Amino acid sequence: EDFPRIDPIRLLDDLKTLRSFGATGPGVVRLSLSPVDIDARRWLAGRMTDAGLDAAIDGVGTVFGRSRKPGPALVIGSHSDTQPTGGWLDGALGVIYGLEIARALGECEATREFAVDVASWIDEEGTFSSFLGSRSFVGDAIDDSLRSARNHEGLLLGDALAQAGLANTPRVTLDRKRQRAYLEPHIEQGGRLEASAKLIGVVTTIVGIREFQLRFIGQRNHAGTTPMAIRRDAGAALVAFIAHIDDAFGRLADADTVWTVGRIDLDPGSFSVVPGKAVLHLQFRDANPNRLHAMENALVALVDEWNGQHLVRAELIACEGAEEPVTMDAALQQHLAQAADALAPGQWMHMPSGASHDAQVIAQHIPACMLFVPSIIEDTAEQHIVLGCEVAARAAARIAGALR
Amino acid sequence: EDFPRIDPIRLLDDLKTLRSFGATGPGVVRLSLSPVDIDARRWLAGRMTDAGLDAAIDGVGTVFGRSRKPGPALVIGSHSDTQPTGGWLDGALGVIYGLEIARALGECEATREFAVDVASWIDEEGTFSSFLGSRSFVGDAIDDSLRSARNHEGLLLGDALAQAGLANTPRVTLDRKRQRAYLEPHIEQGGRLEASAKLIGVVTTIVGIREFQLRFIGQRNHAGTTPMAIRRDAGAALVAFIAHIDDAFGRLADADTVWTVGRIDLDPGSFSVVPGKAVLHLQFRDANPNRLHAMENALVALVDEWNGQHLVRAELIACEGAEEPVTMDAALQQHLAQAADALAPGQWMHMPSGASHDAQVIAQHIPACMLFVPSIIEDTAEQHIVLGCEVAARAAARIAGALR
Ligand SMILES: [Zn+2]
Ligand SMILES: [Zn+2]
């Protein structure tokens, strides 16, 4: 069995060239449809063309390089837009991996026939509308976004596209008869891969998410003259309630469950005033839908129990944008695991993705999978960038070969 | 024994006339040395003159009406400036009580000889410099304040006094050979008097105060990708620490001890970021100096214990302006208690003052005492305003009569 061979110098050169579009100190500033982002997309489309793909920036700003080869296709990609404080490998890694994998599989006689498409989905980070590109590709609803989405400066997405020259450009869309699998390589800086000192992660599931505000309504009072016994301190209620959350969630959790109080506000927030109101922001995530729902039910029950006992009233508010867990395709995961075991024996693991990605959108329509490399100024050692691409290329060869 | 008789109509008329200077909806806006405050001070000085006192607005804006009678003097007063959100009786009550008591003792043949002075100390509320008037009166340091104190608009106190016409006016100062006692009537809205459904409080001690910031230094992390086990969540440390405070302070407290977390801030305060830093503001008050110091020592010890165990570091910062408890004169308290028992039998109690007052400054130089009436839009029933003045006038007669 002959396997393809990536060119590690070519891979790193392209990653560093993409970094130069928007490089700002230790990171990259490249917001969707900004002039520097469009510049990077034109460069990327040229590189896809150089590789022999049919490439263009589409009507929403996605860069898509379609194979010219017949038969079933594997799509490899990620995003190349950033947040205001982006790093040089978030998103860029999987886009350039996809390009190099397309090149390497085309250069190996045994894999030369395999169709590989490469994608940079526009606006994964949501400068205008989160996952605009992957939503557009799979045919999810985008009409509201195209009509009324704005960025931080209030610039309409529709106006941004016209300014980028994309106003009358067709959008690339999924062809379910042709495109049969999706692979998204991505960094992980969060820590699980790093904390395990492993080099390769095979993603099992992209976690679901819940967000809530929890409000506490008590009574303002003078902090000096009001005896402790008659107080209705909303901030004291809030702090006590967090311990109830930790207890109930700890009973339901496994080692991967996460939950976070990201914000606490006391009103009025003065030394000499017992707070009459208080609010916390709560997020939690888990890969297991039963557990995620049981955590929500436990939180609802905690609020009802609290309100049956205490003078400070508790009020739970669901935030828009809850997400369910999204599993990665089991057979694709196993191709990734076989490649990881072949090329990184003893240095790979299965793990959930604690963050959201375009793959969570695409996976609901075609088989999808993700491959993680660790990140430690976001960064990854060059030899680990190379190893990640070697594993991804080997798996891609096997995945694409299996489609026939 | 003949006792003086206040005129309750005259008392209420003066309280309502003073309210008209700055009346704003349900309250009063009358900041020290503002045009409306100066207007009220000119009116007040005229009323003192009408009563037969030697009255003037002094070099710092205090209104002082000095008795023309020989021998030892009782000073009765409070403040007539407000905070931006003031009520019509905070401060005003004791100023107008003092005026009416001076009038009533002068109208009774048995008390006609007794010297009674009446005061409105400037800027108890600290629009420029807290307790400026009572500090100036007792000869505490005010030179720094006169030179560099500013209000919210940055207007210098020295400039404000010149604009009020007070630039070359002598300051009234304490004469310890002549002025032998101070009585400050005041409302209490905080609740102890109200919660007990009593009508008269005899103040034992003005509580001491401590304020601290407590900072927690952990590590920022992505709230989705960072496993719970490796977190250094500064907000979780903060919340856990509050429970330690409550436990340690509860062991030291009696029913009157107070402590309050008035503010909590998590950094950065986002749903998806484990907070890397967190800060709370803590205040506590007590009438017992040993307990107040033991609470401070317990807090220091809690920080040291925390730092010997946890990954998130704790850092305690003392705030300027700590205050010690200040006892009210025991013999004056007993005159107040005798009058309260005579005129409000079964409806009075001893109690600390949980708030600061000019009396805490004056008490360090001459015998001082305070008398509280309840407050429920800050307000007090007219019959309870009248009863408070009847009790204060009877006590004043006995206090002044005892000085000879
Ligand atoms: Zn990404
Ligand atoms: Zn006051």
TrEMBL record, chains A, B:
Query: Which residues of the sequence carry a binding annotation for Zn(2+)?
Result: 79, 90, 186
PANTHER family per record: ALLANTOATE DEIMINASE-RELATED
Cofactor(s) this protein requires: Mn(2+); Zn(2+)
How this chain assembles, per its entry, is:
Homodimer.
Q: Which Pfam families match?
A: Peptidase_M20 (PF01546)
Q: How is the cofactor bound?
A: Binds 2 Zn(2+) ions per subunit.
Q: Could you identify this protein by its name?
A: Amidase, hydantoinase/carbamoylase family
List the NCBIfam families.
Answer: hydantase, PRK12893.1-2
For this protein, the record's Gene3D superfamilies field holds: 3.30.70.360, Zn peptidases (3.40.630.10)
Known EC number(s)? 3.5.1.87
Enzyme class at the top of the EC tree? hydrolase
Q: Name one GO molecular function term.
A: metal ion binding
Q: Which residues bind Zn(2+) 2?
A: 90, 125
Q: Print the organism lineage.
A: Bacteria, Pseudomonadati, Pseudomonadota, Betaproteobacteria, Burkholderiales
What family, per the record?
Answer: Belongs to the peptidase M20 family.
Keyword set for this entry? Hydrolase, Manganese, Metal-binding, Zinc
Taxonomic superkingdom: Bacteria
Residues reported in the UniProt entry to bind Zn(2+) 1: 79, 90, 186
